[PDB]
Amino acid sequence: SELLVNTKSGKVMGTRVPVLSSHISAFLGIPFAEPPVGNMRFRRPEPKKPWSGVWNASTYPNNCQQYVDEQFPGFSGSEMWNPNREMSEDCLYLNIWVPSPRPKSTTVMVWIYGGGFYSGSSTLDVYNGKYLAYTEEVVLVSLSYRVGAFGFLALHGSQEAPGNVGLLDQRMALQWVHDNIQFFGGDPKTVTIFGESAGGASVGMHILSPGSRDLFRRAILQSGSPNCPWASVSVAEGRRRAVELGRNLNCNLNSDEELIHCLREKKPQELIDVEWNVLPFDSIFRFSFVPVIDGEFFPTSLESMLNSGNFKKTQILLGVNKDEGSFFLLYGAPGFSKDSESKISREDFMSGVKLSVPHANDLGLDAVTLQYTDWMDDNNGIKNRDGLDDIVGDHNVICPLMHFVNKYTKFGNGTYLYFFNHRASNLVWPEWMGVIHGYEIEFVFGLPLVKELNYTAEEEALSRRIMHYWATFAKTGNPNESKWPLFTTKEQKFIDLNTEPMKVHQRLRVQMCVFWNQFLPKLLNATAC
Amino acid sequence: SELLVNTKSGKVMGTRVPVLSSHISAFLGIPFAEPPVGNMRFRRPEPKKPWSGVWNASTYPNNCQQYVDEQFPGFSGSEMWNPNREMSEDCLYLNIWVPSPRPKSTTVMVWIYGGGFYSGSSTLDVYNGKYLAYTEEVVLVSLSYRVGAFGFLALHGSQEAPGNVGLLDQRMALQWVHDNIQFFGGDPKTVTIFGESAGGASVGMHILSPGSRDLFRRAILQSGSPNCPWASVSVAEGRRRAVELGRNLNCNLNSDEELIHCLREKKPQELIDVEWNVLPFDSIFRFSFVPVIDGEFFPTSLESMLNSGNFKKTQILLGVNKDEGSFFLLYGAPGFSKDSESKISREDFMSGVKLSVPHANDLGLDAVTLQYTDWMDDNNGIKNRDGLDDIVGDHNVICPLMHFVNKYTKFGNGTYLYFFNHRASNLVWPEWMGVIHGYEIEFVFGLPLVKELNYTAEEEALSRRIMHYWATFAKTGNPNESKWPLFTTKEQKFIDLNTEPMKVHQRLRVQMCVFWNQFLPKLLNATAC
Ligand SMILES: C/C=C1\[C@H]2C=C(C)C[C@]1(N)c1ccc(=O)[nH]c1C2
Ligand SMILES: C/C=C1\[C@H]2C=C(C)C[C@]1(N)c1ccc(=O)[nH]c1C2
C-alpha cells in the first residue's frame, strides 16, 4: 500500500492528505529517538529501539516542552507560532510528506524549525510541508528537537547534561532520514536541510560540526547563521546559566550531579517558568539556553572554523528579510506597542540601542547611535523606530549572516543570497513592523496557494516561484532551471524576492555590516585595554 | 588737506588712489610699533616712539619675513598670495583706506590676514581695501603681524621669547586703531575686526583674550576659529618646537637665553629654511609656530573659556567655504596634483586620512575611514578624493568652527553663519579643488567689480552683496538692512552665499561634526586607557 512503508526501524502506516485538488501521503510522528524523559532529560539522544507491528503515523506528534507566547492572547499573528499539540518531553518525532505516487528516488528537504532555540514545533500550520511536497515533488521531512533547557542546558564536562543535545536530536533525525528515506522515495544523497532563524543557525552548525556534514547534501539558511550573536555561548557562560537556573529552583549547587539530579526532578513547567531569569543582561534577541562552543560538536571557535575552511563545502542558499528587528523590539523594547505606530523618543531609542547591544561599553553604544542616527532630524520618532529596527536586524541577523556568506563563499561550491522584502498583504501585524522575521516561511511553504487564506495572485505567484527556487536548489545545487546570480566575494550579488520583477543588487548592507563585523568589535576590544 | 592727518603719533601724509571711476585716500604703511629687529626679535612689540614731520604714507610697507610658496612658480593662483614687497623684520605697519570726502565718524573694519600663522601680507592684491572702503563708505584698516618663528616662537617663561608675540602685534595695531582712527573718520567704538583662516583664528582669539576685548566692537571670522586643531599649541609643545628649531640651527641648547641668543643671531632666512622641520608629525594643515595656550594671552584652555562664557559677548558673523581641504591635500597629500583630476586610490586615501588626522591611533584612523567611505563603491577615486577633501575641511575648519559657534551663541549677542559655495568663474586652480580655502576673500574685498579681472555679472553681484553684508554687519551688528536668519543653537540656521538666490539651511554638517566634535575625541580618549 502507498501508505505502508518498511523502514529499518519497523513498519510505519501513513495517511493520505488532500492538497490543491489532489493528494499526497503523510507519515506524521515517526519516532527517531528514545523519548528523552526521566533520567534521560538533558542526556544525548538515543536511537529508537525498533518496534514491531505498524507504527500508526497518521497524526502529528507532541511538541517539546517550551515557552508559550502569551503576549497577545487571541492574536493569530502570534499564536500561530505556539505549540498546537500537547507539549511533552516525548516529542522527538519527525514528519514526512511524500508525493503520490511515491517517487523512486527524489529530492529530500528536511525542515529545522527555529524559535531562538527556546521554542518551535514541527506541527505549525505554516510548517505544513504538503504544498511543497505536492507542488515540487520532493519528499519533505520536518524534524523536531528539544528546545530550551531541555535541549541546551549545558554543564560542560558532565555526561548527564553535556549541552548541545538539542543539536544532537537534529543530527539523530538527519541520521534516521539518511538511513530510511530511500524507502519513502527520497534520495539520501540529495538531502537539503533548510531552516529559519535558530533553524538556519542549526543548519549552518551542521555544515560546521564534523559529525554532521556527511548526513546532508546542501543547505538553505533563512535569517540565521551559526555565528549570530544569540546562537551560541561559551561553555563557561553556558555553565553559569545552568547554575542560575538551578538557583531559581532551589537546587543543591554543591555539584553538577546534584544540580542535574535536582533539575531532573523539576516538572517541565518549572524550568520554563524561570527560563528567562538567567540571561546575563537586560537585552532583546538573547535567549537562555543555546548551543555551547564545547569542543566536541564544535571543534573550536566558529570564527576559526570559518577562517580555516574547516567546514562542509557544498552549495548553500541563504538570505535575510527586510525587517528582522521589528518582532524583538515589539516584545522587549520600551516605546513599542502593537496597536500604535510606535514612534520612538530619542530617550527610548537610547534605551533600545542599549537593549540591542548588551555587551557594549558606552563608547560602543556611542558608536551605534552615531551610526544609526540622522543627526539632522534626531527627534524624528519614525526615523528612530526604523533606525532601531535596523540596529536589531543588522546586529543580530543581517550582518552576522553576511560574515558567514563571505567566509563560506571562499571555500564553498556555490552561494546564492536573497533579500526578502515583501509584506504579505494579509499580515495582521502592525505595518511599522514591515517584513518580519519569520514571514518568508509562509511563502517558502506555499500557504499563498490556499485561496481561503486570502493572499493575492501576485503573492501566490511569489510563493510558487520561491518554492521552485528552494526545490530546484535542493535538487541541483542551483536555484535557476532572470538568473539568480551566484554570489561571489568579488561581486556580492544577491537578489530581491518580492512580487515585483526581481532585480540583482550588490553588497547587501555593506556600510552597516562593516560597522558591525569590523569596526564595532575592534572598538570594543580596543576600549578595555 | 584730505591726505594730511595728525595722529597721537605724529602727522601722516597719505595718497589719493583711484577706484571705480572715483577716488579715495590711502595712508599706507603707518608704523604701529617699534621695528622688532635685533635683540627685539621674538620680544613683545613696543609702541612706536612718536615722530615729527609728516610720515610719508604713500606706499605699501615691507612684508614680514616668511615662507614663500614656490610650489608652482609662475602660477598666479599661488603667487598671488606670496609677499609682493621686500620682506623685512621691520614689517609692523598698518594701512588705512579712507573714503573721500573723509567721513566724520564712520564704521571701521580691521583686516587680519591668515596664512596658517606662517605667512601673510597686508599688501596682497586681494587684500586691497579700496573697493570696500569706497563701495561701503567704511574706513578699512589692514594690519600686519609677525608670522612664523618671528611671531610665534615660544619659550614659555622667558621674557625674551614668551610666545604669542604675533598676537600682541595684532593687539598693538588694534590699540593704535583705537587711539587714532577718529582722526581719519573712523569711529573707534564701531570697529569690526575681520579675518580669514589664521586671521579668523586670530579674531576669535581676541574675542577670548581679556587684554584684547575692549579694542573692538564686533567680529567676522572667515574659515577659522580659535579652536581649530592647527591654531594653537600647549606651552610644552611650543617649547619643544623652539628647541628643535634651535637644534636645526646648531644652537647651544644649554638654556633658553643661549638658544634665544643663537636664534637672534641667525639671519631671517635661516629660521625659515628649517621652519617646517619641527612639526611633530607627518601631517597636512599643521604649521610650526602658532599661538601657545600660555596662561597670559589665554587665561586657560580655550575649551574651558568657551564653556564658561569667559569671552567677549558681542555679535559675530562667521562661516566656511565648501571645500576647505583641497588646497592642503594638493600640497601635501600623495596622489594629488594640480594638472590632473587627482582621483585617489584607496591606498592613497588611507595615506591622506593618516596625514589629515596625525594624532589618531589606528582605531581613530579606522573610525575616520568608516565614516568617510562609501563602502559600496570604495575604489572610486572621485569619491575618495572628495571624501578626503571633506575629511581635511571638516576636521580642520568646518567642525571646530561649528563648535565655536554653538559655544559662543550661548552667550553672544547675535551669530550669523554663512556657507560659501561659489567657485569664481575665472579661478585658475583645478576644478577638483572646488570652492577653495581663501577664495571668498576676493568677493569680500570686491575684486569682482574690476571688469579687467573678468568675473561675471552675477559674480559682481555676489561681491557687492557680500560686501554689503560685511559692511552692514560691521555698522549695526546685523548683516540685514531675504533675511539672513540669526543663528540660534536651537534652529541652527545659516545661509548659502552664491550667485543663486540664497536659501537658509540648518545644521551645517551635523552628522560629520558630531563625529569630529563628539565621537572621535571620546574615542581617542577611551582608547589609551
Ligand atoms: C516570527 C516569530 C518567531 C521567530 C523567532 C522567534 C525567536 C520566535 C518566533 N515566535 C518563532 C516560534 C516558533 C518557531 O518555530 N519559529 C519562530 C520564528
Ligand atoms: C588659499 C591660500 C592660503 C590660505 C591659507 C594658507 C595656510 C596659505 C595661503 N597660501 C595664504 C597665504 C597668505 C595669506 O594671507 N592667506 C592665505 C590663505
How would you describe the overall organization of this protein?
Two copies of one chain form a homodimer. Chain A has 529 residues and is α/β, with parallel strands linked by helices. Chain A has one domain (1-529): 3-Layer(aba) Sandwich (Rossmann fold), CATH 3.40.50. Chain A is built from 16 helices and 16 strands. The first copy, chain A, has an eleven-stranded mixed sheet, sandwiched between helices. In chain A, helix 13 (381-408) packs across helix 16. Chain A starts with a strand and ends with a helix. Chain A binds chain B through residues 361, 363, 366-367, 370, 374-376, 506-507, 510-511, 514-515, 519, 522-523, 526-529, and chain B through 361, 363, 366-367, 370, 374-376, 506-507, 510-511, 514-515, 519, 522-523, 526-529. One Huperzine A binds at residues 69, 81, 113-116, 119-120, 197, 327, 437-438 of chain A.
Count of folded domains of chain A: 1
In CATH, the architecture of chain A is: 3-Layer(aba) Sandwich
Strand count, sense and closure of the main sheet of chain A? 11 strands, mixed
User: Ions, cofactors, ligands: which are bound?
Assistant: Huperzine A
Protein chain pair with the most extensive contact, residues per chain: A-B, 21 and 21 residues
Family (chains A, B): Belongs to the type-B carboxylesterase/lipase family.
InterPro entries (chains A, B): AB_hydrolase_fold, AChE-related_enzymes, Acylcholinesterase_fish/snake, CarbesteraseB, Carboxylesterase_B_AS, Carboxylesterase_B_CS, Cholinesterase
Function (chains A, B): Terminates signal transduction at the neuromuscular junction by rapid hydrolysis of the acetylcholine released into the synaptic cleft. May be involved in cell-cell interactions.
EC number (chains A, B): 3.1.1.7
